[PDB]
Amino acid sequence: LYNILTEEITEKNADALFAQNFSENITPENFASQSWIAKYYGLELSEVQKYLGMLQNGYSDSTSAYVDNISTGLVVNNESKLEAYKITRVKTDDYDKNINYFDLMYEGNNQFFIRANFKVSREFGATLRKNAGPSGIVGSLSGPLIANTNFKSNYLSNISDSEYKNGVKIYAYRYTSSTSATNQGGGIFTFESYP
Amino acid sequence: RELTRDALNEAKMWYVRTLELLGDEPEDYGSQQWAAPSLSGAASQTVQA
């Protein structure tokens, strides 16, 4: 049991570990049901909700990347598999996201910023260069501000794969008006979307 | 009631039969994702209509 509990789980040996820990009839497709987990482990729905926040079983497609122990199943564009995506970052005075939503996503057509809630951020966000680095308003929130697909709010092009893989691009200026630049927030970022 | 061994076995039989005809009970599922609306949202006569 100690060996089982103290073995690292990575994508390199993910399937091997799954086959070691579960039978041939126990597949991730079967595991994806909360009632299946409850009837397999002899636990209760609220007790397993203590671990898992909310799994989308025909629920809203609101994305909602959040705190450590969240595994989200969702229908995505360029992956024929439900991906549980985990976000953990710390800029100034922020823990999960805070301040509306300042995060990163992988759901859309290409690699860009997040849409945690589908309403566009009222705060005029400017994506500068790397953490605590002034480079001007490169990604200026402007027209279009459209939805029904994960899109860019006037070419947030600074958000790329480099900042997708454990990035440093949560740092962003605040703008009370449309052009009043001031420094509010900056720190480390971590994103991982996994099976 | 009588706590005899055969009586307890018969009660076991009856209770197993009751479980068999009762099946399996379901649990709460709507409380997983039911949102928390405001009083105005709850009393919206337009939504009710």
Write up this protein.
The structure is cut from a larger assembly and holds 2 copies of chain A. The first copy, chain A, is of the alpha+beta class and 195 residues long. Helix content of chain A is 17%, strand content 8%. The first copy, chain A, has helices at residues 2-5, 14-21, 28-31, 34-41, 45-49, 161-164; strands at residues 84-87, 126-127, 139-140, 173-174, 182-183, 191-194. The relative contact order of chain A is 0.14. The A-B interface holds A 35, 45, 49, 54, 59-60 and B 27-28, 32-33.
What labels would you give this structure?
elongated, two-stranded antiparallel ribbon, alpha+beta, part of a larger assembly, 6 strands, 17% helix, 2 chains, 195 residues, 6 helices
Q: What secondary-structure arrangement, pairings included, does this model have?
A:
The structure is cut from a larger assembly and holds 2 copies of chain A.
Chain A: H1 2-5, H2 14-21, H3 28-31, H4 34-41, H5 45-49, E1 84-87, E2 126-127, E3 139-140, H6 161-164, E4 173-174, E5 182-183, E6 191-194
Antiparallel strand pairs in A: 1-6, 2-3, 4-5
